[PDB]
Design a protein around this ligand. Structure first.
Ligand SMILES: NC(=O)c1ccc[n+]([C@@H]2O[C@H](COP(=O)([O-])OP(=O)(O)OC[C@H]3O[C@@H](n4cnc5c(N)ncnc54)[C@H](O)[C@@H]3O)[C@@H](O)[C@H]2O)c1
Ligand SMILES: NC(=O)c1ccc[n+]([C@@H]2O[C@H](COP(=O)([O-])OP(=O)(O)OC[C@H]3O[C@@H](n4cnc5c(N)ncnc54)[C@H](O)[C@@H]3O)[C@@H](O)[C@H]2O)c1
Ligand SMILES: O=c1ccn([C@@H]2O[C@H](COP(=O)(O)OP(=O)(O)O)[C@@H](O)[C@H]2O)c(=O)[nH]1
Ligand SMILES: O=c1ccn([C@@H]2O[C@H](COP(=O)(O)OP(=O)(O)O)[C@@H](O)[C@H]2O)c(=O)[nH]1
Ligand SMILES: [Cl-]
Ligand SMILES: [Cl-]
Ligand SMILES: [Cl-]
Ligand SMILES: [Cl-]
Ligand code: NA
Ligand code: NA
Lengths: 313, 313
């Protein structure tokens, strides 16, 4: 198939690309490299099925039109986005423009050329879990940051095209994802930051009281879920979560990762008003529709991730 | 108070303006007159509390910035929008730009100047009612047209500002509204169209099988609800419906309005894929928070509306 992966040079994107190339699809990447480098895709530089890596912006309407007009895509995995909650609080407009308007630009061309869209949403668009069964696709939404609001906004434009036009789309809500190729600095995820701090012999710092929880999904499991949603016509028109169905507090995550190599401290929460106290995924729908389940435990994923991070030092 | 009413020269808007002027607030209207004329506000042309009627576009970022920079608004009732489902299917972009992007432009200035926003959403953002209790604010959303998707998108940006910044906002979801000052042509609502057809001695035409239902809210009741949401700090942060809690099929509405003066026919539905089969409102939350309930029955509202339409012929 001919496939466009927006954000394909990013963390999750590069793993989506890897899987699609293993499956011998012709892949085009569209990525402005705002949050990544081509080091994430060097591995694929000699794969003839990686057709092009376009350094361009989903906000550039003319570029997006030309890209679809001059290719014949079957399928688009739309991962390109601004992803940082705090940045979206500091600067809502940029997050809105990238995550809602950029989506809309792509969606318009998907309709013009009958291109199925897998829209990468986020488990952040949820209000907190309230029990051990976790959050299903039927459970309440709560846009606690402009990032979350922009993602919900995008979801609803995407789904409107499915209803109004019968355009194949899937809205996916993976939970917090970690692993090799995730950044380790201030724009990184908590697992990457903590492992890197450990390797650097500096403390782990926990925002707030650390009791907040996350359901942490290893990136290779996430990428397989993302790809599966694109391949499945049964998924068309659906919202589908992915996660592990187990959560951990940030306090306990810090102890797991440090293993007492470094100290663990608390600091003022940067956005307690936008925090989600408990994130725990019910992924029964993904199991049913996609035959998907995660294979990598947190313990094993941390080990894999630390091996990767250490390899770059 | 100093109040901005976007869309204040429109159908519901002019009634909001009337109420705010009765309550002796200083009102500014921002309206591009894309779907209205100043005849809707002639009544107020000598009220010194109607400060300005700006013919300008909420999509014009510079105009919106200047408007807030050079006034000191307390409160904004944001009614300006593209409202037509079929137009949003024919041309999603224009509806998106007006209803989502335009909202965002206003919201950004509301944050800058601490202006409470009442966001006018729509009961269309709902999946169908499934019982006689009707649709509450907790019930499922389904963006069946790009209009509905654009409205849900806007809701989520608005609510994100309440969470991230503690900006006072209210998201209101009134159900289908009818009455004096609603247009009677192809861009009008079903009640206006049917009454006008009756007065013109031409048939009523019903889309599809006519079994679809609506909860029809008289405009003076709607406008009082809208205003109340703005006046109430208890409503801050909430989604709140308004409606009557009774529905009628389009077949039965046509018989009520015609009274057999004219024939009643069925024609192919213009967008059956985007229709909502049953719309019935649970307005208990509005009753509790706002002490609001509707006063005008459908029968009496039809009579009032027909008197008004006849007066213009
Ligand atoms: N990391 C997670 O925990 C997680 C969980 C759920 C969903 N998501 C979603 O998955 C997607 C990928 O996230 P990630 O963690 O890989 O982040 P990432 O930043 O590595 O990936 C996003 C990629 O999009 C590119 N990009 C950003 N804005 C763009 C624009 N305007 N035009 C073109 N390219 C642009 C970036 O340069 C980057 O390579 C995002 O949509 C994100 O919201 C991430
Ligand atoms: N009529 C209903 O049944 C109903 C029910 C629920 C919600 N609503 C919502 O109520 C609001 C008012 O609806 P209405 O029925 O009075 O329609 P309307 O068209 O009479 O009112 C909207 C007004 O906004 C103006 N406008 C449109 N786009 C604009 C732009 N870009 N900049 C500036 N002004 C602009 C129009 O000229 C018009 O006067 C809308 O937000 C609509 O979505 C309507
Ligand atoms: O150095 C860090 C980074 C993150 N967190 C916490 O870890 C969780 C996950 O944060 P991340 O930024 O990875 O993603 P988010 O869930 O906010 O998307 C949140 O509760 C953060 O407050 C932390 O305590 N210390
Ligand atoms: O001339 C008309 C206009 C409308 N309708 C129907 O009346 C209902 C209300 O339509 P309207 O356009 O007023 O508003 P909507 O609910 O679609 O916002 C819908 O089921 C329409 O199909 C109709 O049968 N004939
Ligand atoms: Cl995320
Ligand atoms: Cl804990
Ligand atoms: Cl409406
Ligand atoms: Cl009937
Ligand atoms: Na747990
Ligand atoms: Na009824």
């Amino acid at each position: 198939m001919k496939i466009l992966v927006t954000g394909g040079a990013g963390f999750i994107g590069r793993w989506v690309v890897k899987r699609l190339l293993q499956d011998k699809h012709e892949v085009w990447i569209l990525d402005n490299l705002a949050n990544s480098t081509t080091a994430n895709i060097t591995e694929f530089a000699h794969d003839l099925n990686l057709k092009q890596c376009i350094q361009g912006d989903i906000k550039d309407k003319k570029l997006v039109a030309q890209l679809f007009e001059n290719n014949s895509f079957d399928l688009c995995y739309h991962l390109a986005a601004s992803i940082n909650v705090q940045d979206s609080i500091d600067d809502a407009r940029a997050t809105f423009e990238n995550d809602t308007i950029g989506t809309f630009n792509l969606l318009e061309q998907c309709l013009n050329y009958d291109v199925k869209m897998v829209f990468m949403s986020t488990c952040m668009v949820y209000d907190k879990a309230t029990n051990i069964q976790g959050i299903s696709e039927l459970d309440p939404i709560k846009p606690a940051s402009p990032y979350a609001g922009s993602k919900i906004a995008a979801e609803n434009m995407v789904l409107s095209y499915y209803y109004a036009y019968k355009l194949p789309v899937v809205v996916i809500r993976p939970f917090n994802t970690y692993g090799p190729f995730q950044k380790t600095g201030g724009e990184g995820g908590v697992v990457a930051i903590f492992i890197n701090n450990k390797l650097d012999n500096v403390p782990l710092n926990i925002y707030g009281d650390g009791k907040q929880t996350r359901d942490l999904l290893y990136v290779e499991d996430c990428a397989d879920f993302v790809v599966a949603a694109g391949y499945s016509a049964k998924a068309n028109g659906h919202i589908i979560n992915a996660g592990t169905g187990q959560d951990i507090s940030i306090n306990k995550l810090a102890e797991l990762i440090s293993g007492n190599k470094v100290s663990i401290q608390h600091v003022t929460h940067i956005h307690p008003q936008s925090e989600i106290q408990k994130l725990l995924c019910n992924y029964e729908k993904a199991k049913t529709i996609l035959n998907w389940e995660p294979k990598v435990s947190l313990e094993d994923g941390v080990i894999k991730t630390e091996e990767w991070i250490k390899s770059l030092k």
